[PDB]
Amino acid sequence: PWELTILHTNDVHSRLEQTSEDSSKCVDASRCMGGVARLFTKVQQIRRAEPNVLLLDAGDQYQGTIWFTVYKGAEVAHFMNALRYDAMALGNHEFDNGVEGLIEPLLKEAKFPILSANISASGPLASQISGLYLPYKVLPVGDEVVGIVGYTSKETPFLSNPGTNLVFEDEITALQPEVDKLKTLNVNKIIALGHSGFEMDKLIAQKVRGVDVVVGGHSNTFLYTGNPPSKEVPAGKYPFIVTSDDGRKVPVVQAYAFGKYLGYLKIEFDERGNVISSHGNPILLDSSIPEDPSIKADINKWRIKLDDYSTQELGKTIVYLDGSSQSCRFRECNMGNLICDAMINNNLRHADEMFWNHVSMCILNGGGIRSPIDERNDGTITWENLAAVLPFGGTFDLVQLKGSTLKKAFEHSVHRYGQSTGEFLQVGGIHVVYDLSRKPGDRVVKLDVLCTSCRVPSYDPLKMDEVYKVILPNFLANGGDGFQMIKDELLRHDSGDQDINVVSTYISKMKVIYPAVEGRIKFS
Amino acid sequence: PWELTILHTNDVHSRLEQTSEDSSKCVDASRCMGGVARLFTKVQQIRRAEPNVLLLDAGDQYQGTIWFTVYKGAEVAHFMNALRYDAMALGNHEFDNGVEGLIEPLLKEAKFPILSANISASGPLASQISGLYLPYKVLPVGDEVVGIVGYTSKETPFLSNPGTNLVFEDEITALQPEVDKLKTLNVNKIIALGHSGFEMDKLIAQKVRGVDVVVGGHSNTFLYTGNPPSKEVPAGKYPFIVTSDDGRKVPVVQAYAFGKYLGYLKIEFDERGNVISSHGNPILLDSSIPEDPSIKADINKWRIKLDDYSTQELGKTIVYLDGSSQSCRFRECNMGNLICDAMINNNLRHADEMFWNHVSMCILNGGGIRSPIDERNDGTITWENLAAVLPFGGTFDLVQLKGSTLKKAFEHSVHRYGQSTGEFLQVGGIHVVYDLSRKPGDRVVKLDVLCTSCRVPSYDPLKMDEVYKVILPNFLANGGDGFQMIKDELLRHDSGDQDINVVSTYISKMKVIYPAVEGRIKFS
């Protein structure tokens, strides 16, 4: 048998530095995890021991911390080059800065192929981008070759800013002929590497004839075989075995997110390229693995500009930004309004004639707002100020919730009102009225929401059976602050941009802000 | 006696081209008025006949039409140079584009002195601007000399964007020592030329010892002796005689606005510089006076860039901009919201610790909104589109009104509701609820207004005795659409920026707009 070791990362999301266990800022270094310097160590160790190794990334290196804000992808090229990645698939977040922000710096600077078989361009862009990403790449490994075919979420236009000159084709439709082509070229070992989520990965494994292994991402899916090593709870075994339509067993892998783990899969192939066996597990990148000193030193050098950036003026406020708990856990607060307005602005995507924008609504728990910002420093707002407001390193995600669920969420928001608890909701694109004299669970007396399928945005009563797109913190999507109904009942969930970055971008764009309290939340 | 002819303009406000009788776009040329080409004709004729002539401008050449939007003052320098103005005083609107937008192009390009004795600078700006404007200029006239001392509204920081490195001193305090100084230099004929309004002009005439004549502006004051020649109703005789504290008679003049009239005052002086007699009248620049062909031709050349500019993309809307009468005369409309939001944004001025901004409130009659804008042209908005919405060439002015007055205005807004009349009010910084089943004059059942004297903007009930700053169209400040209570009861009124320009600037700054209908106006 010919044995291949697939090392893989996905959804690293700008975690260049080691992080806390929850992937936020590293505070207690002796317990920190991940980061590229530690990843280097581990990959180097594995490559000393195993002869046939591929190191693959399944997309969404872009977006997640101040590294991406400042270096805009140059950090991704530079550090992925230094780890000698073999291939990367394009993720949705690779389009956050438009096509132009992908082409430079990542496509032009990567020393490894960047792949997606289901993205096509038209017009002058097609000529501009031709060959800068590829449907697949055939790589030599030992004395053999392995074909790697890429794919990207067809929902990318709703989840990033790819523009109107790129078309995201159905993955399976686009992949099959590329895999068929590889077979006619005598390439019998084929990895599908891509960025559409675990559920699509399993459909790819099932339906794309000739794929031997699927390496995925997007959904931040943790898979494990055995006792998990940290706090992440597995969605299934590693690898997850799919029985293909052609009758074969096809492993499917992912490795959570944020660079906390290195996916490690060993595949045995016969001479005809059939998978005989597959076994492995993600490897927790904890502090027992030393950070590579050279990589670390480079990271420390690159940090200097980040530190400088963090105290620069982003924009001005002429109003006090009231992020006090005495306000934001009790009533509409203007910091809440600002943040939810920035969340909707961040989620303006191209729309056809069906809607003015695909999403209009935002919720934000008051417990997520951790500081005010005083306007008396010549009105300046810096990233450092914003990091005090939003200190947890979270994202502002897009979910779909039935109106019933959202009504439950607002009843939860005030179920034990008066105790300064974190669940009280700040809003955008929603007007709510509470009557606190009613019984808990029956306190929402009006709930109106801004339409999307309309040419003129206006408010109408929430409908219990209708599904609404809502932007909200990943902390709430995951059931935090007691919002178990959101976790348990949501119909779709895609991770969004970094919290601080969302707000900082909105402030920069607006230049001078003046959020008011305006009656989004009232009490009878 | 030595006889001087003072020709004077004020508040020309970018009326480079001849205009209609109401100073809007010229439609029927054979009846149009004003413009610099006609002004040239008349000034040239007067200078052929009278030996001792000064041509003076009392400020506010800046701001008013697309000429200023595009040429930013270069048109003012160029055309004022071509008419060979002798001096100009700085107006409030000369600071609309900041100090930098005054220095270049106007101060650096004018071939005549630009004056103000009550503006001082500090810091690096003092060295930058030194001598580019002057407190006064002594001009030779025939074999004599005349001193001209300038002044500018001390309210300029509330009425434009002069920045924080200029201090606007009380006019009388600043003027007296400059006039005293001129007397010690043997200059016994002194004109005060400046831009503070007719009421301050009269106080200057009364209190500044040694001023022989006051030539003013700002208040767009029409003075006439006899039967008026057009539709403007005189505020008093021309000149208006003030009896000075030193016992002399001091003429005070102004000449309306918009270049419709040329002020013409003949002063006889004795050998000691005392005014023996003063008589005159503004001259209506109607079509009986031909436009100078060379000036006209130059104006036509300069127009080309204006025409080109008018169809360029200013920004995008992703929503339909509903400026239909069926909406805006009946209920809250999103075009209304947009325009009032642009009005408040235009009126952000520097604030001390007393208020987040000096003004928070806007009203706009639905009758002032004359077209929607469709978002289906790739979302583009052009100046030409905006000119369809706001076709009258008006301004968005700042007034002070008691809450009682404003309540009367909102009762008027719905007094005969249901007939598609123009008086229905669109709002910003105000939330109103009507009950149309109540009797006319008693239909306003709630009226809440956004605070100014607060660090966090929020809404509180209107107070009948409190005075509120409000931004609104000059058409309403003048009692249009039946709002006689606004005209009759307002406590202060200063003219603002051009309507179209206000909106175009806000759109350009925002880039992508999406105004909603959000409950600013409701019905019980």
Ligand SMILES: O=C(O)[C@H]1O[C@@H](Oc2cc3oc(-c4ccccc4)cc(=O)c3c(O)c2O)[C@H](O)[C@@H](O)[C@@H]1O
């Ligand atoms: O610590 C506090 O003072 C308050 O903490 C609140 O809990 C939260 C914890 C939270 O923890 C995280 C989090 C924490 C550690 C690492 C990563 C993420 C993110 C949040 O947005 C978050 C939040 O929004 C909360 O409201 C509780 O609701 C509240 O009862 C408590 O007072």
Ligand SMILES: O=C(O)[C@H]1O[C@@H](Oc2cc3oc(-c4ccccc4)cc(=O)c3c(O)c2O)[C@H](O)[C@@H](O)[C@@H]1O
């Ligand atoms: O002409 C119409 O269709 C409507 O005209 C309305 O009157 C207005 C006239 C107006 O005239 C001017 C104006 C007109 C000519 C020259 C300069 C300015 C400016 C306005 O904003 C303005 C306005 O806002 C109005 O509502 C009346 O309220 C309304 O009854 C009528 O239907």
Ligand SMILES: [Ca+2]
């Ligand atoms: Ca195979």
Ligand SMILES: [Ca+2]
């Ligand atoms: Ca005198």
Ligand SMILES: [Cl-]
């Ligand atoms: Cl999924």
Ligand SMILES: [Cl-]
């Ligand atoms: Cl006045």
Ligand SMILES: [Zn+2]
């Ligand atoms: Zn991701």
Ligand SMILES: [Zn+2]
């Ligand atoms: Zn993704």
Ligand SMILES: [Zn+2]
């Ligand atoms: Zn003026």
Ligand SMILES: [Zn+2]
């Ligand atoms: Zn003025």
